[PDB]
Every structure is written in C-alpha cells, then in structure tokens.
Write a protein that binds this ligand. Structure first.
Ligand code: FAF
Lengths: 10, 95, 131
C-alpha cells in the first residue's frame, strides 16, 4: 500500500 | 467544480492550537490542517489527507468540515484516522 | 480545494469519486484494498450511489475508469452528527476494484502512530476551487 506506480509531483 | 483532480500540500496543526480557531468544536477524533493559503472545500469531503511515512503514503485524515467559505487562512478539520483505525480493523475482520 | 493545483493523472491511485445515480460527484473516498472504500460518514452514501476509481478528468470520456457498485454502508456507530465527530464510513463494494497502475490502496496508520504538528502532508479531491 501507499506507493503509487505513477509518482505524484507537488 | 473542477473536472480534473486537484492536490495541495498543507501543514498539520495541533488540536490545542486549532482550538484557537474553532474552540470546543474540536474533538479528539479530529485533526486540523491548513490555514496555510490553501483549503479543502465543498465536494472534497470524504477524501484523503495523506502523510508520507517511511516511504509510503499513509491516510492520516478524512476531509470533514471547515470554514463555511473555505477561507485559506482558517484550518480545515479532518477525521483523525489513528483514532478510528481500530474500528476499521474490526469491521473488515468481521465482514 | 482552493488554491491547489492539478495533479499528475493517476498519481493518487486510491482516490475515488462518489457519484449519485445522476452522475453528480458529491464526495471523495480512498481505497484501502480491493473491496473497501473509506469515506466520511456525513457524505450520507447509499447503495444507490456509485464509487468511481481510476478517474482524473471527470470531463473526459476516454479514461478507463471503474464504476463500482456498493454492497453495504458501514457508518461508524460512534459517529455523532450533531458535533460531526468520528466522521467515518466504510463502503463494502459489490464488485472488487481491479488494481492497476492507476488504481491501488493507501496505507492505514497504527493507532499509536504519531503525526507531529508542522508536518507537511497532502490532500486531494474534486471539491470547489473557489467559493
Ligand atoms: C464536505 O465536502 C465539506 C468539506 C469542507 C468544507 C469546507 C471547508 C473544509 C472542508 N464539508 C462540509 O461542507 C461540512 C458538512 C457538515 C456535515 C460538517 N460543513 C462545513 C461548514 O464544513
């Protein structure tokens, strides 16, 4: 859990 | 209402400090965040407030309520997941 | 979210949209596994509502989204609607979500986990961007 395949960019 | 998903980083506040804005409305199963120039608003309710812990995004809050006008200078109030996770665990285990 | 920004499509895989039968988005939610969604108890979800996963642009017709039916609504019995305390509801899906690159679960903390004031976190959603 908690590890997106597509990394978020903030 | 935006068609595309929005995001925003914001800081967590302590309940004590949050009571300076909301007074007694702040309970133990609530956690505040914001008052930083951004704000959750109508339609965001039920959504996530996540914090990265040990490399993984963890659900810390659930968008609950806040300023009637979504003021960015007022903190938003979220359901505090750590105070509700035991119930989540019991519910899944029994269903 | 007021003053937020557009997210990278599919970068918040656990984020779902709760829509009524007319297709109107009224609340957000988070997938904690293939069969369960966590949301706010005050959203007043019913089994006639739909959970939409894998969505980014609610205005697009070309996204491969998953519209999932709700089997049961579990409102936390501790929820107090007068004070809005313990605002949490669990939704058990009739059909399990299909996890993929754009659909997956968020982690849950331990009851004793600590998140200090001052920590910067993130919130997402399709809520109003201007009041
Ligand atoms: C649910 O979409 C919103 C989320 C929100 C709204 C304004 C500021 C911060 C977060 N919650 C509400 O509209 C709630 C609903 C009651 C059931 C608490 N009302 C208020 C005044 O926040």
């Amino acid at each position: 859990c908690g590890v997106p395949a597509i990394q978020p960019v903030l | 209402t935006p068609d595309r998903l929005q995001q925003a980083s914001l800081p967590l506040l302590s309940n004590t400090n949050c009571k300076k804005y909301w007074g007694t409305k702040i309970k133990d199963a609530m956690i505040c965040a914001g008052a930083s120039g951004v704000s959750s608003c109508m339609g965001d309710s039920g959504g996530p407030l996540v914090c990265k812990k040990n490399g993984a995004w963890t659900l810390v809050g659930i968008v609950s309520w806040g300023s009637s006008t979504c003021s960015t200078s007022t903190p938003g109030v979220y359901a505090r997941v750590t105070a509700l996770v035991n119930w989540v665990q019991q519910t899944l285990a029994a269903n | 979210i007021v003053n937020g920004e557009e997210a990278v499509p599919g970068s918040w895989p656990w984020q779902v949209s709760l829509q009524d039968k007319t297709g109107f988005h009224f609340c957000g939610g988070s997938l904690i596994n293939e069969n369960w969604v966590v949301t706010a108890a005050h959203c007043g979800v019913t089994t006639s509502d739909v959970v939409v996963a894998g969505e980014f642009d609610q205005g697009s017709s070309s996204e491969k989204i998953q519209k999932l039916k709700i089997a049961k609504v579990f409102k936390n019995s501790k929820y107090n609607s007068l004070t809005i305390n313990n605002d949490i509801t669990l939704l058990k899906l009739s059909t399990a979500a299909s996890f993929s690159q754009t659909v997956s679960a968020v982690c849950l903390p331990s009851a004793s986990d600590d998140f200090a004031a001052g920590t910067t976190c993130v919130t997402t959603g399709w809520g109003l961007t201007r009041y």
